[PDB]
Amino acid sequence: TRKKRCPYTKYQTLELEKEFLFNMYLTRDRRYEVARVLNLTERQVKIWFQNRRMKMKKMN
């Protein structure tokens, strides 16, 4: 992703990918933790997960 949003690294993408694939849903604290670990905001995780769904639906 080199449009608008910052290009996520492999490590970042892999973690978010595995977490979402493993646990389609997360808790507030867990999301905050994941975000904290990624040195980002909860929004980064919240939107990434949703972006994946929207990508599946729209850009099927």
């Binding site: 992703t1 449009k3 608008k4 949003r5 910052c6 980002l40 905001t41 929004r43 980064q44 939107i47 990434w48 949703q50 972006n51 929207m54 990508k55 729209k58 850009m59 099927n60």
Partner: peptide
């Protein structure tokens, strides 16, 4: 070295605009 960017610059939600 700046705090401009945007609250949605780091987290954009329009990467998937192609509905089709």
């Amino acid at each position: 070295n700046q705090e401009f960017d945007s609250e949605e610059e780091t987290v954009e939600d329009s990467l998937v605009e192609d509905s089709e």
